[PDB]
Amino acid sequence: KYDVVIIGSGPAGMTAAMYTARSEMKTLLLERGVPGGQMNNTAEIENYPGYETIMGPELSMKMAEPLEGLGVENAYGFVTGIEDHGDYKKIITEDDEFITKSIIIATGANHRKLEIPGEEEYGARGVSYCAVCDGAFFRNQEILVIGGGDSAVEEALYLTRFGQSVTIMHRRDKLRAQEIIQQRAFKEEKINFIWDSVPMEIKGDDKKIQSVVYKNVKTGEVTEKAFGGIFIYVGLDPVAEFVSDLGITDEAGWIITDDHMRTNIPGIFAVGDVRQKDFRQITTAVGDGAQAAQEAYKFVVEL
Amino acid sequence: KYDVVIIGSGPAGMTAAMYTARSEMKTLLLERGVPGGQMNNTAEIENYPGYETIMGPELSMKMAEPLEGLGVENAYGFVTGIEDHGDYKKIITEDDEFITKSIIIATGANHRKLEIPGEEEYGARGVSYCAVCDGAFFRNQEILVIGGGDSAVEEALYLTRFGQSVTIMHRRDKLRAQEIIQQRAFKEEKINFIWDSVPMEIKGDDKKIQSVVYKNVKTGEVTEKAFGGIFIYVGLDPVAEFVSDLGITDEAGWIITDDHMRTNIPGIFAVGDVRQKDFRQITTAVGDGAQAAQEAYKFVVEL
Ligand SMILES: Cc1cc2nc3c(=O)[nH]c(=O)nc-3n(C[C@H](O)[C@H](O)[C@H](O)COP(=O)(O)OP(=O)(O)OC[C@H]3O[C@@H](n4cnc5c(N)ncnc54)[C@H](O)[C@@H]3O)c2cc1C
Ligand SMILES: Cc1cc2nc3c(=O)[nH]c(=O)nc-3n(C[C@H](O)[C@H](O)[C@H](O)COP(=O)(O)OP(=O)(O)OC[C@H]3O[C@@H](n4cnc5c(N)ncnc54)[C@H](O)[C@@H]3O)c2cc1C
Ligand SMILES: NC(=O)c1ccc[n+]([C@@H]2O[C@H](COP(=O)([O-])OP(=O)(O)OC[C@H]3O[C@@H](n4cnc5c(N)ncnc54)[C@H](OP(=O)(O)O)[C@@H]3O)[C@@H](O)[C@H]2O)c1
Ligand SMILES: NC(=O)c1ccc[n+]([C@@H]2O[C@H](COP(=O)([O-])OP(=O)(O)OC[C@H]3O[C@@H](n4cnc5c(N)ncnc54)[C@H](OP(=O)(O)O)[C@@H]3O)[C@@H](O)[C@H]2O)c1
Structure with a gap:
């Protein structure tokens, strides 16, 4: 038919x-x-x-x-x-x-999900997979972006319109993204990097995200840092x-x-x-x- | 380098x-x-x-x-x-x-060339492989288009802006072109068809094309008909x-x-x-x- x-x-x-x-x-x-x-x-x-x-x-x-x-x-x-x-x-x-x-x-x-604690709990309230959808909710926040590919890096550059800073956390020391986009991120003053690191836990108050715990994949060093939003681009x-x-x-x-x-x-x-x-x-x-x-x-x- | x-x-x-x-x-x-x-x-x-x-x-x-x-x-x-x-x-x-x-x-x-007589001789002077290039030279002519594919049929439809009529000569009784384009050609009043036919000779005066001889591929019937231009789209x-x-x-x-x-x-x-x-x-x-x-x-x- x-x-x-x-x-x-x-x-x-x-x-x-x-x-x-x-x-x-x-x-x-x-x-x-x-x-x-x-x-x-x-x-x-x-x-x-x-x-x-x-x-x-x-x-x-x-x-x-x-x-x-x-x-x-x-x-x-x-x-x-x-x-x-x-x-x-x-x-x-x-x-x-x-x-x-x-x-x-x-x-x-x-x-793809991180499958870490806090990721589901803070779904409506600090955790996002879509910057054009959600970015404006994060005006003047310290935003975290997880991943090192085209999406992570482009979406981090977009989010600099809203955040005070955007940090890209990648699990190696070399991005996967197209070089032209890497270069734009390297040059952009509101983009910071946490290289060789993976997120372990998203933490918050019972209302919203406040911090992320992460680990360095070469040394095992564990750090916790405050962020107001996290956008996840891990494939x-x-x-x-x-x-x-x-x-x-x-x-x-x-x-x-x-x-x-x-x-x-x-x-x-x-x-x-x-x-x-x-x-x-x-x-x-x-x-x-x-x-x-x-x-x-x-x-x-x-x- | x-x-x-x-x-x-x-x-x-x-x-x-x-x-x-x-x-x-x-x-x-x-x-x-x-x-x-x-x-x-x-x-x-x-x-x-x-x-x-x-x-x-x-x-x-x-x-x-x-x-x-x-x-x-x-x-x-x-x-x-x-x-x-x-x-x-x-x-x-x-x-x-x-x-x-x-x-x-x-x-x-x-x-692709037809590799028939007159095709080279009338290159500058009635024979064309490009309707957007040449069509306006053929205003009010009886134009012939050779082929039954997307190019022949689309380019015939375009050429109806210029010609008195455009005839599509195809070597079978079913076009190869996309059906939407076939349908537009079937409906267009200035498009005629010579089905089941191939061109055998392009003829003219020593200045320009005047006629084309062709043959029916099921019967061998040979016809000669006057045309002022020929556009070739045979692959x-x-x-x-x-x-x-x-x-x-x-x-x-x-x-x-x-x-x-x-x-x-x-x-x-x-x-x-x-x-x-x-x-x-x-x-x-x-x-x-x-x-x-x-x-x-x-x-x-x-x-
Ligand atoms: C943040 C981001 C930025 C990007 N930027 C670029 C770029 O700049 N350039 C570029 O070339 N590529 C880019 N891409 C990649 C590009 O968007 C994709 O390659 C492309 O959209 C894939 O198209 P598609 O039609 O295969 O799948 P999709 O666009 O994913 O479309 C799939 C559709 O299927 C629907 N669907 C799913 N399941 C069902 C169901 N069960 N029943 C009914 N409907 C369903 C969905 O709703 C969706 O609308 C980007 C991707 C992302 C995430
Ligand atoms: C009349 C017509 C209508 C069409 N309409 C459509 C349509 O509506 N939709 C559609 O999807 N497709 C259409 N097509 C098909 C589409 O145009 C082609 O599929 C497409 O352009 C192919 O692109 P390409 O880059 O592979 O080759 P091309 O567009 O052919 O480009 C090849 C380039 O290589 C250059 N070149 C060749 N040799 C050399 C050399 N030795 N050194 C340097 N440069 C060289 C040429 O100058 C050319 O610019 C149409 C085709 C025709 C003829
Ligand atoms: N402009 C465009 O053309 C455009 C834009 C967006 C997307 N796309 C395409 O869409 C496809 C998907 O892109 P994507 O960027 O969404 O996914 P992707 O290509 O799979 O990249 C995912 C990135 O996240 C990293 N990663 C995975 N897990 C991590 C973790 N737990 N912690 C930190 N980093 C982690 C990956 O690391 P590794 O590199 O080590 O694997 C990789 O760098 C690609 O083929 C891409 O090119 C294209
Ligand atoms: N809109 C579009 O997307 C668009 C537009 C133009 C072209 N294209 C594409 O470009 C490619 C080429 O297209 P095309 O139309 O130029 O070539 P084509 O697909 O090879 O079609 C050539 C047509 O001419 C016929 N033919 C061959 N020799 C002949 C002869 N001696 N006398 C009469 N008819 C003859 C063929 O017959 P048979 O069918 O018997 O083989 C065929 O129907 C195609 O893949 C096509 O889809 C696309």
Whole structure:
């Protein structure tokens, strides 16, 4: 009944949906939230070719704009499972079932947790995984940012708009982030570093965070320092629970595809951040999405 | 002396160059012509995520804009060859030589010729491979477009701005173009079709084209019909002459890569339309470019 159902309306899904709709495939695009995916949790995007710098939620709106005029059917849905019935597939959401000849899984990735004490307790109250969401709550605070990748370092630079200082705590002595971003952080006067360190405990009063205990990974030295907020950027986990049974995931839970976005299962493709891969960017999301869309067209044509 | 040299400044090269420069790689971007590649020969781009519709040369300018501020060194060059000297590579242009640790080949593809009589003779004078370049010379003419793919059909739709009529001659009875574009052509009153036909001869007076002879591929029926211009869109050939010796090309001349944009030769990558692949779009150009850029960074880091 659908030719293709795309699950997730971040940039990979949105590109896939634009491409399938342009091939006049009967196209359903399911999204649990706001179109844009991670781009809506991104302050400034500088490396999407075509735009010099653009705010994440604006790029999200621009990518979403044409979809309805192309005849993509946009619908709310949280997908909880997928069943392979051979020559069609069923997709289960909270309240619905959808039958389709093909599926493109574009559900992305989620913030990895520290799994330390205080992290859950202070969730609403000092602990954050999203600087554009929460930064303004931390005006004039000493902010801590955990991680040494692109997100940690970019989000620390963004947060300097609000905080008195932002400290980046990284578990080695060399950042993973792109050098251009490293350099901007090195030069920014409101950015401090705690190198070779990991957080051990987030502590507070029963209302909000007050301090963090951490440890040096070369010496075991333990320090406790006051902070008013902590933003955590220690990597990603896959958003793929709805296929855990199906035999298309690696040991960490990422969806395995070949180079044409194909899983094990004929007619189920996966694109973007949810796939097993190293390089997670909007460029490769868009690329993957277009490729899967063309593979779904051919699969459905042949069916 | 360069960390990376990218050859060609279409969207794949431009994305690669943006990414390498952001990793602070000493980056040279060589282009024989105008930045933009094929996008500058494209009238309206509707399927680049982020833009609802944009003229090709404008998207070209937007992609080129940030490169110099990122420290990409933009230079004129027609590359004629590449030598692998093990731990560095040399690139030869008309007048220069460049030494680099890595190379990303982003030189794209060129219009395939019909290789029929009149095609060369009327090159300047009725025969064209570029509608945005030449269309306005054909105002009120009966224009012929050869091919049944995305280019033929889109470029025929564009040309209806100028011609009295545009006829699309395709060698089968079903177009290859995206269905949305097929449908727009079917509905457009100024588009006619000559199905199941191939051109045999382009004829004219010693000044300009006047007629085309063609043949029906199911019956052998031969027809000659008057036209004032012919635009040819019968597919692509690789632009890779400068590596023909090197053992990285297939029998048709496309550059073979794995899924990380790697050739046989360590430190030489290839991206975008020049690669052996099926799906040639700006989305997959940009994707390939970003991936190669990250692979070049790692290669150079390890060297
Ligand atoms: C802080 C930050 C800054 C970044 N900055 C950049 C940058 O500047 N440049 C860049 O190239 N990349 C950047 N990235 C990476 C980029 O955002 C991602 O690579 C990209 O968004 C991945 O797109 P996607 O479509 O695969 O997944 P996502 O954008 O994650 O979209 C997945 C979508 O699936 C939906 N979804 C998930 N589960 C379900 C379900 N069960 N049912 C229905 N819908 C569901 C989600 O709501 C989401 O909208 C950044 C990432 C972060 C966190
Ligand atoms: C008429 C038309 C319409 C199109 N419309 C669309 C569309 O709407 N959407 C879409 O997604 N795709 C479209 N495409 C496809 C898209 O343009 C290409 O996929 C894309 O431009 C490929 O980018 P690239 O960087 O790999 O190669 P290119 O854009 O071809 O760029 C290659 C560059 O290399 C340079 N170069 C070549 N040889 C050398 C040399 N020896 N030394 C130095 N420089 C050199 C060239 O001058 C060129 O600038 C269209 C194509 C055509 C022809
Ligand atoms: N501008 C952009 O293009 C952009 C922006 C944001 C994100 N992204 C992409 O999105 C993907 C995810 O990025 P990310 O930065 O969110 O994750 P990431 O690349 O996995 O980086 C996580 C960082 O946190 C470190 N870390 C992990 N645990 C830690 C701990 N317990 N204490 C201190 N530091 C810890 C990691 O250390 P190690 O380095 O030792 O592993 C790493 O440096 C990447 O592929 C990235 O390039 C891109
Ligand atoms: N909007 C976009 O995304 C867009 C726009 C333009 C181009 N592109 C991409 O760029 C790539 C190249 O596109 P293209 O259209 O230039 O080439 P293409 O996909 O190779 O299509 C060429 C068309 O011409 C036909 N043909 C070949 N020889 C012929 C002859 N002698 N007489 C009549 N018809 C003949 C082919 O026939 P058969 O079909 O029988 O082979 C085919 O239909 C494609 O991958 C395409 O999708 C994309």
